[PDB]
Every structure is written in C-alpha cells, then in structure tokens.
Amino acid sequence: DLITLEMVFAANLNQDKSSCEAILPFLNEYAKTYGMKEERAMAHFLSQVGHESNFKPVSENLRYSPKGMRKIFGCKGGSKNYDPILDDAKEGRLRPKLWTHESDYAFNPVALGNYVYANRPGSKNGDESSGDGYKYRGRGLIQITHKDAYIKFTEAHNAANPSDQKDFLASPDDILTLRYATSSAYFFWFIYKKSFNLHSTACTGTVKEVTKIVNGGYAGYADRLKRFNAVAAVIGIDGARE
C-alpha cells in the first residue's frame, strides 16, 4: 500500500488503533483514484485529517443553548462581537430572531441550521424555508458544508470513481460513512481547494502554509505540526520545524 497502518496510527498520535484499522482501506483506495502518490503531501494530508477528525467521521452539532446560538450565529462580525454581560450584539444583531424568536431556534438543530446557514454567499444554500441550511451542515473528516460543497463533491467523487456513482445532494448523510468521509477528504484536498494549490503547497511547503489553506486560519497549528512530524518519522522523511 501507499499508506500503512503505522502512518495512520502515527497521525492519530498513537491512539485508537482500531479506528485507524477501520479507515485504512478507504485511505488507500481513494489515494489511488484521486492521485495521492507524493509522500510529503500524504504526511500533510494524514496530519491535517487526523487533527480535524481523529479518523472518525463527524457531523456538525447544531443543538445550541439560547445564549450559545446568539454568541456564535447572532452578531454582526461573528462571536467576537457577542457581549456576554448584556447577552447582546456589540455592533448589530445579524440574526435578530435568535433574540425575538429564541424558543424556536434554541435546542432545535433543524430550525437553527435552516436559519443561520440560509442564503450564505457563495454557498448556494437557499432561504430558511428551503431546508438547505440544516441539510448541508458540516460532515466528514475535514468537514464540508453548504449546498455548493455537496454539488462539487458529487461531481468530483463520480469523476475519480466512475464505477461507484453517488449523489450526495440526495444522500448527504453518506459522508458520515467511513468510505465517503474518506472520499470527501481527498476531494477537499485535490479539488475543493485546487485554486489555493493545497496539494502543491503540501509538496514543497510548510505545515503553517498547509494549515492556512485547510483552516482559513491557524487553529490547532501546533497539533497539526506534531502529527506531521510523527508521520514523517514513520515514513523516513524530513520532519518540519514549521
């Protein structure tokens, strides 16, 4: 194989061996069909996937308390503008129904997701009554979210795996299976972020630079680097100081 159990276990910080064993065949199947051949890129991929997911598929949790949903989804400019003391937005309520229609959205993942992800720019989600917001919530290993990602994953997975045609608009929960969570990770890597040259950057770049593309930021940077070096060691590749 291109990916051994020891690489996956190392990317998983030597935890949950059986989760690593369960996902190993899909990891190898889709590295072949999507074209993961380069070893330094693979070490970045395993370390980024391991940090995001620990190789277990995850679905976004949209069950929030009243204050919790206001903090994360209610304020213009995001949570940085939540005033905990006032339970209010510092620079304007972006989603005012989280205040006036509190009981409709708190602890109601379907209603909340349909409201807070409605009409998101670039996302192809329709309005609150379309059901797009909850339906295309985050799923996978590196989570993909919103209608646009599920369109693009459908086309990308079918292009790379023509003998296993799927429709993740019709069946979005399949991304919670190990098989299509793994396919979606490779789609993220090679297709979804192609315009940022994620794969190229992993080939000759830095953990920090890979992290910037994957995360849109530097969240969990130190842990992603720790995982990469552990993978580099098992492979025989130079580690990374950055």
Rounded Cα distance between 45 and 2, Å, is: 13
Q: Give yes or no for a contact between 169 and 158, defined as CB atoms under 8 angstroms apart.
A: no
Tokens of 27: 């990891």
Inter-residue contact 213 to 203 (CB < 8 Å): no
Residue with token string 């059986």? 18
What would the two tokens of residue 106 be? 């708190």
Cβ atoms of 145 and 137 closer than 8 Å: yes
Please give the Cα distance from 45 to 56 (Å, whole number).
Answer: 15
Distance CA 30, CA 141 (A): 14
